[PDB]
Amino acid sequence: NIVGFTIVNDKHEFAQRLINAFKAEAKANKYEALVATSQNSRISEREQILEFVHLKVDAIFITTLDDVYIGSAIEEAKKAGIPVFAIDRMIRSDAVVSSITSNNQMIGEQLASYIKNELIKQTGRSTGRIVEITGTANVYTTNERHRGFLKGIENEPTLSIVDSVSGNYDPVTSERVMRQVIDSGIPFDAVYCHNDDIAMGVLEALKKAKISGKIVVGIDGNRAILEAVDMKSMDATVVQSAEEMMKVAFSALKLHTKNKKIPDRFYTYSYLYD
Amino acid sequence: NIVGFTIVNDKHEFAQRLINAFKAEAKANKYEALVATSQNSRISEREQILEFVHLKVDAIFITTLDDVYIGSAIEEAKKAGIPVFAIDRMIRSDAVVSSITSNNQMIGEQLASYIKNELIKQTGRSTGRIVEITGTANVYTTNERHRGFLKGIENEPTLSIVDSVSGNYDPVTSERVMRQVIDSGIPFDAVYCHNDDIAMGVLEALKKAKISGKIVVGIDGNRAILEAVDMKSMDATVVQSAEEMMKVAFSALKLHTKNKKIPDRFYTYSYLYD
């Protein structure tokens, strides 16, 4: 009757979209939704998982801050026969039944091809100098988005990453670090942001430093970024589907209540908005 | 001041979209546009390429039926100093400047992930038997879409292609072939169609056979199929962008004239339409 969901925080707009999607789908599946936010505190996330176990919920959904830190807590859920599903950010552990996320490697690849085409279309040149502002390290979504992009440019001699630094999916951190890249004097033609919060910071850094004409891309599909692209302050953003993640997640849960084989992971579709 | 475009036929809706995109972009680039159709005739395709060369066109765009057959003709264009670009269907020839197409393997992987998810959401089962109806033999697009799909199910032991036959990207051929599959009595849960025209024939075959509940997907994003999926007569299709292929193609032409380095290939974006 009850499914618990703990997520890194209420800040990220995509996190809010995951929360709302969770509430809607739980209801649609006749489960009471219990939502908990860790507000960027691993201790709080660990305790929230342990509380869900103490409450003997039917299942635990998690969008983790650090999958390693909650390892023992998740194993505690497994011990109690409580299925745990990782949402948005994969968690590798036998205590996790399945991970439901976007195909982040594919996203990285699509953005690489996108930047390549936009460079030719917009600059009339083949050479491409890219700056990568990555997400929080040690988070699979970050590793996957980085790998996918590298994969998209590995066989492209005219394309390379000239600087890579972490923006930690945070607008303020991203602005400050993009600022450093700018002060670095390093010449670049494009900026690959690992998510829209990072993008908001990058645009601020570019706007304050009076730097335009750069191809800038993000991920998530958050309102402010969709409008940034609509106003052409930005080129494009890949829209993820919080709704689809929760629908697929609840379908996996159903399979589990039926004792059926469940894929280790599911990928939800995305759509490049330009 | 003319760019020539030769394409297999005028029947496919995607071909029409390619023709319309070519004319629009040719005009946007202040070029006169000549369009020729070979009606699935390799012989007329060759002569059409040779005719463009004779006319001293500034560039030739090709959507071939057999990239090997027109091998000598393309080299002729090169000898005459006429750059050739492959659109939609890749051509493997050092006589070709570049191939602009969708990332067909990615499309195949995208469809594999969709079917896996949809089978579970709709059937409540993880096991899925898939019938694959392919496009014209040994053509880059067909093999790429097949290979991509296989990659997408390689780690799913419960998912398998129970039958794979060709539909020649033709609605009638596809309906007949699908009807043959139905009469063979082979059990199946979904049908992977290499394009929307095949999907049309498949839907017709299932309709007349009074078979419902099968997950059917296509590729192209043609109006008829978009409408079919809206009405839930079909499940989904991956939309390609003929416009984007031409835009990139003309941009490539520009860099080529400035004697710049040009990638052997460009991939245009494609997304899943649900």
Euclidean distance between CA atoms B229 and B197, whole angstroms? 14
Would you state the torsion angle of the CA atoms of residues A234, A191, B106, B91, taken in this order, to the nearest 10 degrees? 100
Distance from CA of B183 to the nearest CA of A (A): 31
Decide if B18 contacts B222 (C-beta within 8 A).
no
A79 — contact with chain B (CB < 8 Å)? no
Q: What is the identity of the amino acid at A103?
A: N
Euclidean distance between CA atoms B17 and B23, whole angstroms? 10
For helices A196-208 and A171-183, give the axis angle rounded to 10 degrees: 40
The distance from CA B3 to its chain's CA centroid, rounded to whole angstroms, is 22
Q: Which of B97, B100, B120 to mutate to test the interface with A (most CBs of A within 10 A)?
A: B120
**Domain-by-domain residue ranges, chain B?**
1-103+247-269, 104-240+270-274
DSSP class of B240: P
Q: Where are the alpha helices (DSSP H) in chain B?
A: 13-28, 42-54, 71-79, 104-123, 140-153, 171-183, 196-208, 223-230, 242-257
For helices B140-153 and B104-123, give the axis angle rounded to 10 degrees: 40
A262 — contact with chain B (CB < 8 Å)? yes
The two structure tokens encoding residue A104: 């982040």
Distance from CA of A240 to the nearest CA of B (A): 12
A267 — contact with chain B (CB < 8 Å)? yes
The residue of chain B with its CA nearest to that of A109 is B106
Helix (H) or strand (E) holding B5: strand B2-7
Q: In what order do the strands lie in the sheet with A32-37?
A: A32-37, A2-7, A59-63, A84-87, A96-102, A265-268
Q: Which of A259, A269, A274 to mutate to test the interface with B (most CBs of B within 10 A)?
A: A269
Among all chains, which residue has been given the structure tokens 């941009």? Answer: B251
The residue of chain B with its CA nearest to that of A252 is B120
Residues of chain B neighbouring A264 (CB-CB closer than 8 A): 155
Helix (H) or strand (E) holding B35: strand B32-37
Q: Which residues contact A54 (CB under 8 A, 6 or more apart)?
A: none
The two structure tokens encoding residue A30: 């006749």
Nearest to B261 among A126, A261, A270 (CB): A126
Q: In what order do the strands lie in the sheet with B190-193?
A: B159-166, B128-134, B190-193, B215-220, B236-239, B271-273
Q: Is the CATH number of domain B1-103+247-269 3.40.50.2300?
A: yes
The distance from CA B266 to its chain's CA centroid, rounded to whole angstroms, is 15
Instruction: Please name the residues between 211 and 250 in chain B that touch chain A, using a CB distance below 8 Å.
Output: 244, 247-248
Nearest to B248 among A117, A156, A258 (CB): A117
Instruction: Please name the residues between 18 and 57 in chain B that touch chain A, using a CB distance below 8 Å.
Output: none
Decide if B172 contacts B205 (C-beta within 8 A).
no
Euclidean distance between CA atoms B141 and A64, whole angstroms? 40
Burial group, residue B111, by CB count within 10 angstroms (0-12, 13-18, 19+): buried
* CB pairs A-B closer than 8 Å: 89
CA distances from B159 to A98, A246, A258, B188, B191 (A): 17, 22, 18, 11, 12
Q: Is the dihedral of CA B114, B116, B117, B120 positive or negative?
A: positive
CB atoms closer than 10 angstroms to residue B251: 23
CB contact under 8 A, A263 and B156: yes
CB contact under 8 A, A255 and B121: no
CB atoms closer than 10 angstroms to residue B194: 31
Q: What is the identity of the amino acid at B186?
A: I
B265 — contact with chain A (CB < 8 Å)? no
The two structure tokens encoding residue A187: 């010449």
Cα radius of gyration (chain A): 19
The residue of chain B with its CA nearest to that of A251 is B121
Q: Which residues contact A227 (CB under 8 A, 6 or more apart)?
A: none
Decide if B135 contacts B241 (C-beta within 8 A).
no
Count CA atoms within 13 Å of residue B28 on its CB side: 13
Q: Which residues contact A27 (CB under 8 A, 6 or more apart)?
A: A33
Helix, strand, or coil (residue A53)? helix
Helix, strand, or coil (residue A48)? helix
Decide if A161 contacts A131 (C-beta within 8 A).
yes
Residues of chain A neighbouring B254 (CB-CB closer than 8 A): 124
Instruction: Give the residue among B68, B51, B39, B69 at the shortest CA–CA distance from B4.
Output: B51
CB contact under 8 A, A120 and B248: yes
Strand ranges inside chain A, DSSP E: 2-7, 32-37, 59-63, 84-87, 96-102, 128-134, 159-166, 190-193, 215-220, 236-239, 265-268, 271-273
DSSP class of A239: E
Instruction: Give the residue among A136, A203, A204, A143 at the shortest CA–CA distance from A169.
Output: A136
Distance from CA of B264 to the nearest CA of A (A): 10
CB atoms closer than 10 angstroms to residue B121: 16
Nearest to B251 among A120, A254, A255 (CB): A120
CB contact under 8 A, A158 and B126: no
Burial group, residue B44, by CB count within 10 angstroms (0-12, 13-18, 19+): middle
Euclidean distance between CA atoms B116 and B153, whole angstroms? 8
Q: What is the identity of the amino acid at A260?
A: K
Instruction: Give the residue among A196, A121, A107 at the shortest CA–CA distance from A152.
Output: A107
CA distances from B160 to A42, A84, A182, A262, B152 (A): 41, 27, 51, 16, 11
A120 — contact with chain B (CB < 8 Å)? yes
Distance from CA of A91 to the nearest CA of B (A): 18
Q: What is the identity of the amino acid at A190?
A: A
Decide if B49 contacts B29 (C-beta within 8 A).
no
Instruction: Give the residue among A149, A232, A199 at the shortest CA–CA distance from A14.
Output: A199
Options 3.40.50.720, 3.40.50.2300, 1.20.58.220, 3.40.50.2000; CATH for A104-240+270-274 is 3.40.50.2300
Euclidean distance between CA atoms A110 and B264, whole angstroms? 17
Q: Which residues contact A210 (CB under 8 A, 6 or more apart)?
A: none
Whether the domain at B1-103+247-269 and the domain at B104-240+270-274 fall into the same CATH topology: yes
For strand B159-166 and strand B128-134, is the pairing parallel, antiparallel, or unpaired? parallel
Helix, strand, or coil (residue A49)? helix
Helix, strand, or coil (residue B80)? coil
**Resolution of the solved structure (Å):** 1.9
Burial group, residue B30, by CB count within 10 angstroms (0-12, 13-18, 19+): exposed
Among all chains, which residue has been given the structure tokens 């309709």? Answer: B207
Among all chains, which residue has been given the structure tokens 């006589």? Answer: B95
Count CA atoms within 13 Å of residue B171 on its CB side: 11
Q: How was this structure determined?
A: X-ray
CB contact under 8 A, B272 and A268: no
